[PDB]
C-alpha cells in the first residue's frame, strides 16, 4: 500500500 | 522537460520500496514514491528538480541497476 512507501520513506528521511 | 518525479520501468518482480528509494539517494532527498508492481514500474519524487537532473545524467552513463538487473529510467510529466 501507500503504507509501505511512507514507512520506508520515513526510515531514510 | 526536467521534472521532480522520475519514472522507472523494467523493475524486478519483488523490488522492495527500499530499493527504488535507494536509487535517488546518492543525489538528494527522496520526498515521495509510487510503485506499480503490476506493471513492474514505479515513480520517485525528489526534493529538487536539479537533483532529478543529476539523477538522469548519471544514469545515462552508469547503467541504473537494481540487484544485477538493469532498469530503464526517464523523466515524467509531473
Ligand atoms: N529521516
Residue numbers in the entry:
A (entry chain a): 143 to 155
B (entry chain A): 56 to 133
Paper text:
One of such splicing factors is polypyrimidine tract-binding protein 1 (PTBP1) which regulates a distinct set of splicing events by binding to polypyrimidine rich sequences found in introns. PTBP1 binds RNA through four RNA-recognition motifs (RRMs), that together recognize the polypyrimidine sequence for high affinity binding. A unique α3-helix is found in the linker between RRM1 and 2, which can be considered to be part of RRM1.
To validate the interaction of the stapled peptides with RRM1 we attempted co-crystallization of either peptide P-2 or P-6 with RRM1Δα3. We observed crystals with the stitched peptide (P-6) in space group P21212 which diffracted to a resolution of 2.9 Å and had 16 dimers of protein–peptide complexes in the asymmetric unit. Also, we observed density of the hydrocarbon linkers between the unnatural amino acids which, like expected from the design, point away from the binding site. The placement of P-6 overlaps well with the original α3-helix and suggests the same hydrophobic binding core of I76, L80, V85, M90, and L88 on the RRM1 domain and A150, L152 and V154 on P-6. Additionally, polar interactions between E72 (RRM1) and R146 (P-6), the carbonyl oxygen of V85 (RRM1) and N155 (P-6), and side-chain–side-chain interactions of N87 (RRM1) and Q148 (P-6) are observed. No significant conformational changes were observed in RRM1 upon binding of our stapled peptides in comparison to the RNA-bound state. However, the influence of P-6 competing with the native helix can't be observed with this protein structure, as the native α3-helix is not part of the protein construct used in this experiment. Since the peptide does not obscure the RNA-binding site of RRM1 we hypothesize that the stapled peptides block the correct orientation of both RRMs for high RNA affinity. To this end, we synthesized a set of hydrocarbon stapled peptides that mimic the helix and identified P-6 as a potent inhibitor of RNA-binding with a Ki of 9.3 μM.
